[PDB]
Amino acid sequence: DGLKYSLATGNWGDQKKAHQARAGVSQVLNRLTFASTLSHLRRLNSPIG
Amino acid sequence: EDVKLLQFHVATMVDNELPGLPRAMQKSGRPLKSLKQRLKGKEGRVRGNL
DNA sequence: CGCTCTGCTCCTTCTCCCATCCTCTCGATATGAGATCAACTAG
RNA sequence: AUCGAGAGGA
DNA sequence: CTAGTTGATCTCATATCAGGAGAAGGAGCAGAGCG
């Protein structure tokens, strides 16, 4: 359930400390077109805010 | 101790963003929405609904 | 000359704020017995 | 339905 | 008058880092001023 929750919601951390956890990890794969999918699989994020 | 707990509950009912104090929590760590937060600012009662 | 009365700057705390509007998806979120009373429900 | 999150549009 | 039946209601009991800005308080020092 820990792995399932983190991958399902994108909150990297325990379900109880969801406010503390960083969000936006583990997004839903974009399937509008093939290029969209490829770009989504090669995406980088700066957690700056 | 029970007086302290009652004071905490009342205060967090009115204001749940007090610096230093613990946050009143619903479940799964979700903090309660206090009366002050209903009116505070953007999307609040005044700016958001009047 | 001791003692007080400000008062002056300064560091600390703390509290506040951070464009508008719109669309979508996705995950999580008991039961009865006894007592009291009051309305009957009749004698 | 509510809350949050995310992705988007101008 | 006057007891018996009918509903509602309450109690009680049973387990197991890459913010910032400004205003208010307190602190310590410095001196002035008068007993």
Chain A residues with CB-CB distance to B under 8 A?
Answer: 15-19
> From the Cβ of B22, is strand C under 7 Å away?
no
Planar angle of CA A2, A6, A8, nearest 5 degrees: 115
Q: Collapsing DSSP states into helix, strand and coil, what is residue B8?
A: helix
> From the Cβ of B29, is strand C under 7 Å away?
no
Two tokens, residue A11: 């909150």
Q: Write the DSSP string, A5-47.
A: HHHHH--BS-STTTTTSBPSSSPPPP-SSHHHHHHHTT----T
Q: Collapsing DSSP states into helix, strand and coil, what is residue A1?
A: coil
Planar angle of CA B5, B30, B50, nearest 5 degrees: 95
Q: Resolution of the experimental model in angstroms, please? A: 3.5
On chain B, the residues whose CB falls within 8 A of the CB of A15 are 28-29
> From the Cβ of A48, is strand E under 7 Å away?
yes
| Cβ A44 vs Cβ A31: under 8 Å | no
B31: nearest Cα among A34, A18, A21: A18
Q: How many CB atoms lie within 10 A of CB B29?
A: 15
